[PDB]
Amino acid sequence: ARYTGPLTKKSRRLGTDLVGNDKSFERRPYPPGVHGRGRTKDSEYSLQLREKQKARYAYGVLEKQFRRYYEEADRAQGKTGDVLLQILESRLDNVVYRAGLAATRRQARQMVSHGHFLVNGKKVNIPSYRVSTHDIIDVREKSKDLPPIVIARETFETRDVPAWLEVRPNKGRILVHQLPTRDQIVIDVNEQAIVELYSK
Amino acid sequence: VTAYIPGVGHNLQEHSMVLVRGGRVKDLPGVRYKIVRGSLDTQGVKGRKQARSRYGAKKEK
Amino acid sequence: PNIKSQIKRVKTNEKSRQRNKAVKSALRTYVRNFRRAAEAGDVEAATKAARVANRQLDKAASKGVIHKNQAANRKSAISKKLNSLAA
Amino acid sequence: ATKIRLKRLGKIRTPHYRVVVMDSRAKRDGRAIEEIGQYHPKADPSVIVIDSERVQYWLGVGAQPTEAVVALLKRTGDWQKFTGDTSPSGVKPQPERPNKDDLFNAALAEADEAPREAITKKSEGAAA
RNA sequence: CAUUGGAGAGUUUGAUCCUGGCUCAGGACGAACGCUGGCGGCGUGCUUAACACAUGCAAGUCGAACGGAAAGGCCCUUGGGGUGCUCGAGUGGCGAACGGGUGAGUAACACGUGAGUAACCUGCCCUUGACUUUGGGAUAACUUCAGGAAACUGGGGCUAAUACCGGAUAGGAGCUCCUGCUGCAUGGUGGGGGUUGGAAAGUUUCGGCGGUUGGGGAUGGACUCGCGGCUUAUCAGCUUGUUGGUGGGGUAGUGGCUUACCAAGGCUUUGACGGGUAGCCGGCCUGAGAGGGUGACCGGCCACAUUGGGACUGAGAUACGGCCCAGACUCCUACGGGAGGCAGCAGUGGGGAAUAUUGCACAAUGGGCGGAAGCCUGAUGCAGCAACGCCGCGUGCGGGAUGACGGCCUUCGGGUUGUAAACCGCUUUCGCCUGUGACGAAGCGUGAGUGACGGUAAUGGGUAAAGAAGCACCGGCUAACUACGUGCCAGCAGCCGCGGUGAUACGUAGGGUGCGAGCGUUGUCCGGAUUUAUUGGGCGUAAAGGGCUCGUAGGUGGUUGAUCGCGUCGGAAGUGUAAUCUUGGGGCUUAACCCUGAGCGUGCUUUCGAUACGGGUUGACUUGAGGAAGGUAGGG
RNA sequence: UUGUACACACCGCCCGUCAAGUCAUGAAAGUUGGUAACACCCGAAGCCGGUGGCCUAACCGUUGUGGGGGAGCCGUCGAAG
Numbered sequence A: 001a002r003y004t005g006p007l008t009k010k011s012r013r014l015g016t017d018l019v020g021n022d023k024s025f026e027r028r029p030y031p032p033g034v035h036g037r038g039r040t041k042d043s044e045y046s047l048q049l050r051e052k053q054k055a056r057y058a059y060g061v062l063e064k065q066f067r068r069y070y071e072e073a074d075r076a077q078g079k080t081g082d083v084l085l086q087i088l089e090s091r092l093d094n095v096v097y098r099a100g101l102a103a104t105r106r107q108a109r110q111m112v113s114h115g116h117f118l119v120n121g122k123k124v125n126i127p128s129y130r131v132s133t134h135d136i137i138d139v140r141e142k143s144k145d146l147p148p149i150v151i152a153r154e155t156f157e158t159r160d161v162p163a164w165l166e167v168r169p170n171k172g173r174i175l176v177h178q179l180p181t182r183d184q185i186v187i188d189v190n191e192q193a194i195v196e197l198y199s200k
Numbered sequence B: 001v002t003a004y005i006p007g008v009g010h011n012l013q014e015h016s017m018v019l020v021r022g023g024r025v026k027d028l029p030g031v032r033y034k035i036v037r038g039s040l041d042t043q044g045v046k047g048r049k050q051a052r053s054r055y056g057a058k059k060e061k
Numbered sequence C: 001p002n003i004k005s006q007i008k009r010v011k012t013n014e015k016s017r018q019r020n021k022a023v024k025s026a027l028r029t030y031v032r033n034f035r036r037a038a039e040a041g042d043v044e045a046a047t048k049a050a051r052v053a054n055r056q057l058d059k060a061a062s063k064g065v066i067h068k069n070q071a072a073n074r075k076s077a078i079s080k081k082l083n084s085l086a087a
Numbered sequence D: 001a002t003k004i005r006l007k008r009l010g011k012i013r014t015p016h017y018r019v020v021v022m023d024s025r026a027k028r029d030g031r032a033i034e035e036i037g038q039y040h041p042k043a044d045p046s047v048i049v050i051d052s053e054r055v056q057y058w059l060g061v062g063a064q065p066t067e068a069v070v071a072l073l074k075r076t077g078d079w080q081k082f083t084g085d086t087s088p089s090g091v092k093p094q095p096e097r098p099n100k101d102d103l104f105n106a107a108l109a110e111a112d113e114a115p116r117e118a119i120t121k122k123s124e125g126a127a128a
Numbered sequence E: 001c002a003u004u005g006g007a008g009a010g011u012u013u014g015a016u017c018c019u020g021g022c023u024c025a026g027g028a029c030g031a032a033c034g035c036u037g038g039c040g041g042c043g044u045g046c047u048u049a050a051c052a053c054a055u056g057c058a059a060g061u062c063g064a065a066c067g068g069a070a071a072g073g074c075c076c077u078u079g080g081g082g083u084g085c086u087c088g089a090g091u092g093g094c095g096a097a098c099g100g101g102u103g104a105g106u107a108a109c110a111c112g113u114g115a116g117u118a119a120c121c122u123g124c125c126c127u128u129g130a131c132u133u134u135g136g137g138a139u140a141a142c143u144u145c146a147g148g149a150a151a152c153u154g155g156g157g158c159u160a161a162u163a164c165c166g167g168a169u170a171g172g173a174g175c176u177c178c179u180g181c182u183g184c185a186u187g188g189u190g191g192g193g194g195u196u197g198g199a200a201a202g203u204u205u206c207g208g209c210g211g212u213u214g215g216g217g218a219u220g221g222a223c224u225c226g227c228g229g230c231u232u233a234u235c236a237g238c239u240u241g242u243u244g245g246u247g248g249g250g251u252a253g254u255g256g257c258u259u260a261c262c263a264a265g266g267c268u269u270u271g272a273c274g275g276g277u278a279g280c281c282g283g284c285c286u287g288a289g290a291g292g293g294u295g296a297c298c299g300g301c302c303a304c305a306u307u308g309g310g311a312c313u314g315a316g317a318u319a320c321g322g323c324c325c326a327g328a329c330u331c332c333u334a335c336g337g338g339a340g341g342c343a344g345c346a347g348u349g350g351g352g353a354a355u356a357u358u359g360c361a362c363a364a365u366g367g368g369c370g371g372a373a374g375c376c377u378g379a380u381g382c383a384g385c386a387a388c389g390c391c392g393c394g395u396g397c398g399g400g401a402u403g404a405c406g407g408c409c410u411u412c413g414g415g416u417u418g419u420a421a422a423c424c425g426c427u428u429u430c431g432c433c434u435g436u437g438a439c440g441a442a443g444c445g446u447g448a449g450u451g452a453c454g455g456u457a458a459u460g461g462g463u464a465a466a467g468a469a470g471c472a473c474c475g476g477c478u479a480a481c482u483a484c485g486u487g488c489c490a491g492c493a494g495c496c497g498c499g500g501u502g503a504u505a506c507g508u509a510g511g512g513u514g515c516g517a518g519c520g521u522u523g524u525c526c527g528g529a530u531u532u533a534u535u536g537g538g539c540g541u542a543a544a545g546g547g548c549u550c551g552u553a554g555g556u557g558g559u560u561g562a563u564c565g566c567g568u569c570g571g572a573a574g575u576g577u578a579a580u581c582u583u584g585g586g587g588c589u590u591a592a593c594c595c596u597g598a599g600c601g602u603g604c605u606u607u608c609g610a611u612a613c614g615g616g617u618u619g620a621c622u623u624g625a626g627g628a629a630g631g632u633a634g635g636g
Numbered sequence F: 001u002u003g004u005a006c007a008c009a010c011c012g013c014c015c016g017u018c019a020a021g022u023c024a025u026g027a028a029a030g031u032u033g034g035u036a037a038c039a040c041c042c043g044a045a046g047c048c049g050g051u052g053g054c055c056u057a058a059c060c061g062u063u064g065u066g067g068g069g070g071a072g073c074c075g076u077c078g079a080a081g
């Protein structure tokens, strides 16, 4: 119920950097496997499916839960892709990643599932915990000196925190100013393509 | 009814108890059912390594 | 029966059936006596029989052998017949 | 007889009762003549909401409460208004009150010791 | 004075366009099967044989109604005190008609919805007005006798009641007569008079708890009715208590419900009668919607309890764990005769592709009895079992080029598996080990005490990157390709098709893709299918205009005045339980799930308005239509 | 240029008997079941309607009994056969 295999293979297949940089993605222009350099047809399904899989492997969400997110966004009022990206960003592991306390979303999932975090006073070990507005995520007092935590404390200045979060790095406290908007989620997929895909 | 027996390999014979599922064989007039390999007397195809579940072949170490 | 409550109940049901049957048969006999007096056309005999039958119908209704509505219906029939006889 | 009783609802190991009015012969979780209140005992200082006018009407018309509903009416004070008896009538204590916006504004500004205990944990990694 | 909603593809030809079927991509399930399988949360789990059932349990309770004393318990030289609590068996009261099960029957006022009863009954409960009077005779238990293998049965004697039966006294019960106000026809209701009548029970630990009868309330039931929801005309006639009337009877009650007499009706091509299938619904699935399919859990109504029939008791009966008779079954028998009904819970056999434990507790909620403590509760709360469904989590995280070996491919250059590994540093959710340890109980109990679930959830500590990944697919639709083997063989396939020696379609391998504790297959339903087209199709040649006309029912209607207000439209009130569903808040660490507010409940009834249109009633007009007179053509 | 059902292109396409095999279906002397009823005969339980010479503690007595009830019996209906 969690993808544990290599991520560079998925990034190469999907054609975009799922996470990180300056890595084995120097072989980017071609998917993994023996048949990587051949010319591709890329149907509309192919395109749509690529966008959906890009979002899925970026956020570490499997198909059933991603589908559930899709119906929630579709029911919600407003743009379906905007709401879907808003939900995926409101996931707690992504919140930790965006605040910059984790090197990657996989590391954020690791620490969240291991329970190194407090949500507004209550301990949460659910990576899919949907953080609500005005929430206060806190690092567990016992685990305020994790090696990944201190690496993040050394590196966060380079990292860019989105406008909808406030982070007290050394304190391990992520204040949620508001639930993010499409202009605030970084554009790296085609949510419109995903929405069109979930209609066929 | 007449039932097809899929897969390379066959053991079932006269008065062998079988499980019969739906399924048409297009180039066979009058065959509208197939025999479920790996159930009751009929057994899985011997040398399967791909699509084993559809032929009732247990996984090999 | 399989329940001792139910065995007790069949015994008491038989007892109540005897009681109710006796009372109903007495009611029927009294009403028949009034009807035969009315057919004979007597006035005093029919009046006395009607009084007796109505009193017994009310007594049975009080005892619960018959419903008060049934007692009222039969009393009404008897009284109307007696009035027709008098007229 | 008409009863004022509790109709069980909710999950396994999580009961929420509806103080309802129905006759004795009816099944426990069935059609009710009227729904009067709710009773959540699983929650802290159990929640007890009873419609005073309706419960007074049903008591005055002759509905018989179950012992649980008698306890709830004692706590709501209805069991004293009807069948006047000397009982404490301990109207439910509230199950306290949290808040979110005030805490967020308190911490947004908290700053100071936020990043301050934060550089203290910097000294901690030093100690780490 | 805007919308929350609609995707196609393949295949007829040498090629094309159209028509058109077939097939597929989606969703779903009370599913089964194959391979595989870690955990948790919440649900669900005989759809077939309404098949036959071993065993335990599922309905009892009351000594504050009664005689009592067979047990325990106190007091006494072992019996004895019924003496006090207590208490088998027995009378008596109440309950047993609820709860629980199943869906066989039923095409029907069974159900949904809305009304009517001036045709109704209603124990316990609440309320209010009267009362609770005077007598008497038995009987179970017990005792004795006789009979029976048993089940048990019949005598003799004996005994108590809130058991049973006389009487008195009591309206709004019968009959009848005045009179007030009135409805919807039968009528309803207020007041007075005459006449004939109808009850009861006592008990206590003195704190209680009960009895009878009027009138209201609440509750539950009953009947009647308008409207609504299957198929079949290769079923056209059906009915004789049948349709109506009058008198009687009956019933809680109206009624051919029943009866006697009289009449000859009643239903039906707008489908009676017959056949087929089926419990109905709130809902569920699907769908843009309209619809289509469906009636598991949960909730409402109905029906049924071995098959058929019947009543009895009761406030109330298809009387599941009642009775009687018959049939079919099973069992006991001493052969004379007896006993029984899991579609209650668990369970067995059987059938089947297929569906669980002969579990714990009355702690919570609900129910029965008791004044109460309390007793009973296979309702229910729980646990066990199964990936059956939904949801959540894990099987690691960061770094790591020297792009290592090894597989596989190759153009022998290399490429690929692949940051994958090795290696380095981390983290400890779940699992395993160990500690702490609940809520549910503002209950209950005079108190003492009191949680089945349960050492459970939750949580601290410890272990090791470890105990934890499979399944399908890769010609097109359709995301993903090569090598080797095979050689129209073996085989594949949902359709098009593939295999005849270079197979991206068979088999294996490497690589890849989609999903993931699941993944596929089969079955079934809806979608796509506008492929029954009301929304939303057509009929010259593609399937489709009757051979033609007349004409019945039916459908439909030129201009206009007046009026009705049935359709139609707009308010109001009532109803549409709950759950579900949509949505706003809240709780479970999140989610599923749960609670709560609102909406929805697409209707129906009542009532008040509007009168443009449809229709009804009614009156005009002549242009449609027909007629008169004259003219007139023709193988009618 | 005209016609066409040919496009493997007239050495094309294509129709029906007969012969062989396979599958589904119709008829058929008959044969074997099932369901739903009908008309009669008989008719248990039971309710109802009669009757009751037998049996009867409460009621009344002119205290020899009577009233009323019950067993039994008959009749209608009536499942099954």
Ligand SMILES: [Mg+2]
Pocket: C025, C029
């Ligand atoms: Mg007699």
Ligand SMILES: [Mg+2]
Pocket: C073, C077
């Ligand atoms: Mg009468």
Ligand SMILES: [Mg+2]
Pocket: E012
């Ligand atoms: Mg053609």
Ligand SMILES: [Mg+2]
Pocket: none
């Ligand atoms: Mg072709």
Ligand SMILES: [Mg+2]
Pocket: E087, E088
């Ligand atoms: Mg006893």
Ligand SMILES: [Mg+2]
Pocket: none
């Ligand atoms: Mg029921």
Ligand SMILES: [Mg+2]
Pocket: none
């Ligand atoms: Mg049902």
Ligand SMILES: [Mg+2]
Pocket: none
């Ligand atoms: Mg009495």
Ligand SMILES: [Mg+2]
Pocket: none
């Ligand atoms: Mg109808």
Ligand SMILES: [Mg+2]
Pocket: none
């Ligand atoms: Mg009549």
Ligand SMILES: [Mg+2]
Pocket: E278
């Ligand atoms: Mg049926």
Ligand SMILES: [Mg+2]
Pocket: none
């Ligand atoms: Mg239906």
Ligand SMILES: [Mg+2]
Pocket: none
């Ligand atoms: Mg049900």
Ligand SMILES: [Mg+2]
Pocket: E314
């Ligand atoms: Mg009765």
Ligand SMILES: [Mg+2]
Pocket: E319, E322
């Ligand atoms: Mg019973």
Ligand SMILES: [Mg+2]
Pocket: none
């Ligand atoms: Mg019952």
